[model samples]
Target: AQTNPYARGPNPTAASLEASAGPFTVRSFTVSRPSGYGAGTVYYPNNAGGTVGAIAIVPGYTARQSSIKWWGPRLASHGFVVITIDTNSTLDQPSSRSSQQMAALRQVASLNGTSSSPIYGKVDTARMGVMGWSMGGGGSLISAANNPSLKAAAPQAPWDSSTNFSSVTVPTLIFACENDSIAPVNSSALPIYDSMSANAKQFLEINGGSHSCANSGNSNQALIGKKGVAWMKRFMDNDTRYSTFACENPNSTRVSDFRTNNCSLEHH
Candidate 1:
């Protein structure tokens, strides 16, 4: 429900840098608005090694970098260079929602394309993934479903009907809550799980959760999000060992909707 960033406490400042507070190199940057958004940040994860992989992050509607900064640092620790992009404003003056999302990926793809990029030698473009929330989640689904450039998509509590979730062709994980009105079970999440491409893989229905619980301090949320560590490693790192965790164990609360899976970990 929170909209205007200007009204949000504290302007963008160095003291608030999350990635720097952790192990990664945190930065504030502005990607030129294709006409709609103001500049956005890169949130580059300084790699101890060359870049292992990268994830372009998109935040929820009416949200800002602060929303994702928590998740970004945690991901950086896992060896992913997390780039948190800012979305377009409502005025349609500088950028639109769609353009802002695509531009972030395109910009990153362009960087990965040549040695000119600071991450050129480090990033493995082939392993690119996108993680989005709410409206931002919808944006990611719409773009990645249409763009083969995205290898993995994790759309958490997305705007299912409007975002085109069923059309997503990439390997995706739908992270949702048991009682999320913003993206309710009967409406958004379930329909998406049913309509995914046959070849696609998913871990659907996180229970006792809410649309905003994906943020930090929700240890219960981690009951689901912790899986992301393994999932990202399996798909992005291509580590065969981590693949086992990607399987839908109906018994696992960390893996399925608590309502059906019942946190029981049973398949049937």
Candidate 2:
């Protein structure tokens, strides 16, 4: 079995060891949902030489694909197929948003079997993950709770009505904004993180951060981006190389709080 396709054979987090866009270029195109679920942009690593795990991303309420679009190139370059989708309605609630996110993932699975599709045979449908921001993050939690087959989830400043996600067996990483007026970390993120007891989970709060702190373009990309990519790569790819990054407490000024359970760099 492949150990860690997303990183170099040696040191994983080293600047020279990180995966770049050069080995495999990224290609993108539009995916239309005739059933009115939504449309999305699919980004995948070209000539990766083998199938790779896929991740579906959705934006928050009143947000478009642009909000979470940066995750596509960032993850795709690292050997994961990524799709950034737009919901049928911008104001759709978390329940409806979860439906669209799943629909988008199903579409990506179909594209893998379609010989004419650009992503033909490029996706490992069985190995999938979900992520998003705000309402979309809440929807991602819903998706992880409902879809047991999903491998991982990373929600940024999640906002949702249902706080009890005890049924979510999939690994999750919650990125919370320290001072979020929109969702209020104390009530939303903390409750949700505390509710997940069956599987590995984490909570990271950005110091003095706002609600939109971890979106497409942000000043703290250096920290947030690393954590996001590491969490997905660690869980979705089952790569032990990313364990330190995903589980270790990042003692940094940018991070105000960090917590984790059942996390260790030793993959075994």
Candidate 3:
């Protein structure tokens, strides 16, 4: 059997898969940005045996790192470095939030080469991804559109003024909440997914879910959490073993809506 760390192996939603606690011992610390873009809490697998891709996660308006902190350990355990950050200001809009999210990714890349940093050489800067919630999610979409270098993006309950993301070529997975009043699926997530016809994309809506449906400590984490990790691993890590999980239909009642385009992973 291939020893790809990101391979779903036998279980996709096993307790250890999404659990804050996992096979690899995780170590985390704070990272400060002098430019005041914001500070970040980074999570990585201790003694991971090799460098891995990194992901930058941002929280929505009036939210902080704590809101999306669960992803740090969740993604880190699965062979990637995860950074959950707080905006310089909680009232930041989508554009400003997008800028900050990219800044955080830059900082992570720099830290990989920083000799004095604990995370030195632990990050694979060439492979990167971004994710966020609500306005932060909207900002993530904006980041993907602006930064074509990003390998993947997964935004949850995203909200933005614009509907078109025609410029985004990065693979994207959007989590939409069926009952989101803040970022309605009809006007936001749907249109954004439709606009991105040029790249691989997917939209999964949780049945009767709320705006905060996919955030940290969400009750539907089992399903959404598994999907999130699979999408990132398949795209960011370029691991074909995760293709079935990312591309196949779960056929569950919890999923009210699902759509995908160019989601296949070509066989090697």
Candidate 4:
């Protein structure tokens, strides 16, 4: 019988996806010396069976890791090593966030090989992803646009001054907020989504959500977490088992708008 070596846990169900935790017991460690960015805390499955892909998440402008901390265990428990970061400065812009986001990923790669690290030998450094909120989300797009080797990107309520990310080839999932005064979905997220016409991408707008809809302490974690984790699994781990979960319309009352394109992995 043929099976995906990368696939983890049991077959996914709607109920399973909605749950707060996954099958794995998770553990975390803080970065001792961060490079190029600020600080980071890495969360990982105690026994994901083997080395797993890593993801780096950044917070929005004027925010701290607490803004995105909910993602650490949510993603880590589902068979990934997640790093929720702190920007060098609270007011860092998208471009600086982009550089810092990549730096966090680079630090993750190094931690994977560092013998004294808790995540040592537990991460597949070659396969990595990026994520963030607001301007940090903008940084996620910038990193994807510049680094073709990246496995995937999933940013929420992203804010970039320029929406010309047509050059990005990395698979992306943009979480939008319908009533976002900070970064309006129409002006920021939508245009950014439109620019990437060729990549496997998706835009999910939260119904009645504000700029912090996808941030920590939100009421939409059930649906939002599922999509975020699924997108990373589909692209970063190349797990076909997550394709349907990642591409489906999600026909939920919690969503106000949705769009997707080229959600296929067959092409080189």
Report the poorest 10 consecutive residues by lDDT, candidate 4. Answer: 1-10
Q: After aligning candidate 2 to the native by TM-score, how far in Å is the CA of 151 from where it should be?
A: 0.2
lDDT of 1 by residue, 1-268 (tens): 4342111122222223222243445443445453234445554555534555677667776777666656666665555656776665522211144456666656766665667545565466566777767776666677666676566677677673452355566667667766787778667766666666533456466666677767555554333444555456556665544444554453554434522211222346
- TM for candidate 4 is 0.96
lDDT of 3 by residue, 1-268 (tens): 6566544223444454445554556789898653447779989887666788889999999999888988888788777888898999999999999998988888888888989977899888988999999999999999998889999999999988898999899999999999999889999999999999889999999999999999888888777877888889789877776787888666789999999989864554
Model 1, global lDDT: 0.57
Query: Per-residue lDDT of 1-268 in model 2, one digit per residue for the tens?
Result: 6655644223356342233332457889987653346779999988666788889898999999999888888778777889898898899999999998898888889899999999999998989999999999999999999998899999999999989999999999999999999999999999999999999999999999899988888777767767777888788878777888889888789899998998865657
Give per-model TM-scores.
0.72, 0.92, 0.92, 0.96
Q: How much does each candidate deviate from the true structure in C-alpha RMSD?
A: 10.4, 2.5, 2.6, 2.0
lDDT of 4: 0.91
- On TM-score, the candidate that comes out on top is 4
Report residue 129 deviation for candidate 4 (angstroms): 0.4
Worst 10 residues of 1 by lDDT: 5-14
**17 in model 1: Cα distance from truth in Å?**
23
The worst-scoring run of ten residues by lDDT in candidate 3 lies at 6-15
Give each model's whole-structure lDDT.
Answer: 0.57, 0.85, 0.85, 0.91
How would you encode candidate 4's per-residue C-alpha lDDT over 1-268 as one tens digit per residue? 4277677777788778779998899998888668987889999998888789989999998999999999999999999999999999999999999999989888888888889988889888888999999999999999999998899999999999899999999999999999999899889999999999768999999999999999889999999999998999889888888888999889899999999999853557
Whichever of 1 and 3 has more TM-score, that candidate is: 3
Candidate 4 at 230: error in angstroms? 0.8
Ranking by TM-score: 4, 2, 3, 1
By lDDT, the candidates rank as: 4, 2, 3, 1
